[PDB]
Design a protein around this nucleic acid. Structure first.
Ligand SMILES: [Mg+2]
Ligand SMILES: [Mg+2]
Ligand SMILES: [Zn+2]
Lengths: 129, 60, 50, 152, 190
RNA sequence: AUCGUGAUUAUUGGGUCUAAAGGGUCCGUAGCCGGUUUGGUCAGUCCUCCGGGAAAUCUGACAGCUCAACUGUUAGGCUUUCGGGGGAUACUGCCAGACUUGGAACCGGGAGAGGUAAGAGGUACUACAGGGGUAGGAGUGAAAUCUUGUAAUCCCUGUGGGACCACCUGUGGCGAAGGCGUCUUACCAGAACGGGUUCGACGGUGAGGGACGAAAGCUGGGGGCACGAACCGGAUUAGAUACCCGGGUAGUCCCAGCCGUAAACGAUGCUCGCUAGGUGUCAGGCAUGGCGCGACCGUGUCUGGUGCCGCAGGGAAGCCGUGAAGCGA
């Protein structure tokens, strides 16, 4: 049964990047999916995305502009504080100031650079680079 | 597109005896007899129902 | 150095560089986009071939 | 996905189109369809084919789109609903018939497994309904005594 | 179309193969009742014109033309004579472009394949050396290691002669080469 | 010895087709994992505050021991992973609904060696008896036992017997697996397919635990044509307690239970999304051409199975490859 839509969407984005496809569809869209896509768009790694409702949870027509290398969910969504980002960055990421971790926070969902700027932490959501 | 559509379609069948302006579903799972007088508008086939009277116009 | 079908870098051996078959602007292709026939779109003249 | 107790997945879904409105090509009204639903219910017709006969002989595309209510919502509104859900009643009815058959064919182990799968589905439905307060907390599915057609 | 579709109907160019592929869908416009699926003749002329524009950016003595079939053999030789391109009609040595000590060594800048499936070795050699290739597929062809696709029937003698003459005249007009050859020269000896 | 080496205990961070390793299959509790969505809370969580978390040892410097370790001051570390307040509501858990795709329920025309129960049937075999006929039949590498003059072999007639379901048959089908092939009937079940049909997350997996579980074997009652461990006999051979051949018991079969294991195999547990293609055939549905333009058969196409081929991908390779051994949950 479908029980991890954000990880499914990021795995689809990984597959579309690996084949080099410019565009790909996203299986059922969610609000955290849209927040991850918006933060990734502001990172410049992902081009475009539109919620095309289908009388269902809704899907995405995402235009991959060829800027990423791999992106999946962070499982478990680890609790993280302002003084706890660098170890996750050293684990998932490949290099300093290279790629970002999608974070969910009470202020908002955003990459951990802007979360460290906010001085507020929370749960890791995903990673893209 | 990205949205799903109903490939199966309705009809506008007209009754052969009482001239009723009844409405039937194309992929009928039941014998859609006429609502009013005496007629069987179409019989339930496993796929598309076999209409016996006039179809005024197939709708969406 | 950047493909028109994938944009990946042509650092490997086997990269083919050629001008456009419509406008003459340079268009690149990789082995994966050439083995798999990835459609390439010319960003200047909009030419799209398989 | 796969089925409940057989892993044979299938995609024979009934494709209902995106309709946020009632029909514009039909002159049928909400009162007409609710009267038809009540009369067919009083005939003795279960809710699965009530909508089917609405959509086939009357060409009603969907009761919720026009009336604003589903079949069971109209049933609860008019006090014309059963005390037990139709899916649980159907599973219990099939299980009772299968047990009646299996009490004379004791070699029929395949249908014994079929009875076990239907019992698993019955307990799943009872667990969901007691989760959602449709059925009483103390009323457990007794497969020998408290399983009759109308339970009281 | 630069040439009328009735001529392509008569010459056998629009006849393909009873089985097609999914990537050849974009060059097919309609399924014929016989089984042989007709390609897009307008798309065929578009691909021919685009290739001739691309082939006109290079000298004929740097182009490479290869063919395998007998029916594509004579028009390939006609193309080689009318352009001066070094053709490989008939049997092909697997190490011509590579193998500098071998007979038939060549270092081209563009490759032309008369049939990509049959001329698989030339495709592998061009991919190894890194030379972009304009290919001539059919209804049952795949464009792997292919840069440009020419949708024409390579199993018809008249279709091959007509297509080779069209490509030759188009390139020779684009590159202002004197082209005194006529389609009967490119037509197979009947 | 112990740590590291060693990702040789692997949450980070390993494998489990062939190297040790997928449980025979499956149902299923605690656990664990869980759809989009409006409304409310803020417990984990989050930022912050305040009470703590003895020094010692740790780090750096300063100061002072001649450098040094060392003692004091000091800025950090540990002590942890407690108690209690304020802010936030993304996240998950709590509260109340909804939503249709996930699963569940019903209807339709079709498919199937799917299951039990009953019966009939096909041919061969065999038992005895009868008729014909008269020197061997059987078997082997070759032989002999065996069988036959009490008339066998072979042929004809007739009556009973028990097992067994051929060709049809398929790189077909159904089934959870084991497994299921004569036919008819009754009972039951699942599936896919069609479905502007009912339901509203009701779902996945699942240590324990439960049922099914090939064959052999065991217990009790039957049956015993054939086959056939044991056993006996005839050869082979140095020997033959074996292969071969002649007999043939238990058993194979049925009826009522037990054991619970197989190379129970795809040596690949199950569920979901995702990822070039070409290519048989099967069920259903669907277009069209022919069809005695009807019951029917062809090509195309969607869905679900059933096979081969193989790019990318991955592997140590054989290979796998939308039916993963690919990429994630
Ligand atoms: Mg047995
Ligand atoms: Mg297994
Ligand atoms: Zn009527």
């Amino acid at each position: 049964v479908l029980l991890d839509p954000l990880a499914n969407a990021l795995s689809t984005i990984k597959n579309a990047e690996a084949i080099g496809k410019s565009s790909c569809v996203v299986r059922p869209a969610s609000k955290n999916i849209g927040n991850v896509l918006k933060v990734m768009q502001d990172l410049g790694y992902i081009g475009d995305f539109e919620f095309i409702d289908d009388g269902k949870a809704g899907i995405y027509s995402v235009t991959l502009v060829g800027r990423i290398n791999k992106c999946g969910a962070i499982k478990p969504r680890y609790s993280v504080g302002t003084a706890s980002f660098e170890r996750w960055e050293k684990q998932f990421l490949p290099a300093k100031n290279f790629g970002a971790l999608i974070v969910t926070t009470s202020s908002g969902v955003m990459s951990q650079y802007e979360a460290r700027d906010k001085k507020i932490g929370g749960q890791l959501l995903a990673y893209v680079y | 597109d990205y949205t799903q559509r109903p490939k199966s379609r309705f009809l506008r069948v007209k009754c052969n005896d009482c001239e009723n302006e009844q409405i039937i579903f194309g992929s009928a799972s039941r014998k859609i007899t006429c609502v009013v007088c005496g007629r069987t508008l179409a019989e339930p086939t496993g796929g598309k129902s076999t209409i016996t009277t006039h179809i005024l116009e197939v709708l969406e | 150095e950047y493909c028109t079908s994938c944009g990946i870098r042509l650092v490997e051996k086997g990269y083919v560089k050629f001008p456009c078959p419509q406008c003459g602007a340079e268009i690149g292709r990789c082995i994966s986009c050439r083995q798999q026939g990835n459609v390439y779109t010319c960003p200047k003249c909009g030419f799209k071939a398989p | 996905m796969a089925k409940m107790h057989t892993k044979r997945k299938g995609k024979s879904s009934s494709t209902r189109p995106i309709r946020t409105d009632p029909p514009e090509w039909c002159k049928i009204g909400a009162d007409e369809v609710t009267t038809i639903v009540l009369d067919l219910w009083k005939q003795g017709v279960s809710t699965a084919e009530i909508g089917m006969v609405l959509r086939d002989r009357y060409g009603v595309p969907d009761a919720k789109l026009i009336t604003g209510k589903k079949v069971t919502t109209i049933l609860k509104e008019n006090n014309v609903a059963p005390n037990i859900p139709e899916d649980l009643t159907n599973l219990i009815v099939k299980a009772l018939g299968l047990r009646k058959h299996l009490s004379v064919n004791k070699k029929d182990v395949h249908n014994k497994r079929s009875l076990n799968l239907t019992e698993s589905k019955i307990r799943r439905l009872v667990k969901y309904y007691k989760q959602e307060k449709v059925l009483p907390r103390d009323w457990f599915y007794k497969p020998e005594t408290a399983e009759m057609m109308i339970t009281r | 179309s630069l040439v009328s579709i009735d001529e392509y109907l008569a010459a056998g160019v629009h006849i393909g193969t009873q089985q097609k592929t999914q990537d050849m869908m974009r060059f097919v416009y309609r399924v014929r009742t016989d089984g042989l699926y007709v390609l897009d003749i307008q798309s065929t002329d578009e691909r021919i014109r685009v290739a001739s524009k691309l082939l006109s950016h290079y000298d004929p003595a740097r182009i490479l033309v290869v063919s395998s079939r007998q029916y594509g053999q004579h028009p390939a030789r006609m193309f080689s004579r009318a352009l001066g391109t070094r053709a490989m009609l008939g049997r092909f040595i697997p190490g011509s472009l590579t193998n500098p000590q071998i007979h038939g060594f060549f270092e081209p800048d563009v490759i032309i394949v008369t049939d990509p499936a049959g001329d698989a070795q030339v495709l592998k050699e061009a991919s190894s050396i890194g030379v972009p290739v304009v290919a001539l597929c059919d209804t049952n062809n795949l464009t792997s290691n292919v840069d440009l696709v020419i949708p024409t029937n390579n199993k018809g003698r008249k279709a091959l002669s007509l297509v080779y003459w069209l490509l030759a005249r188009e390139v020779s007009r684009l590159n202002d080469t004197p082209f005194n050859y006529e389609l009967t020269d490119f037509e197979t000896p009947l």
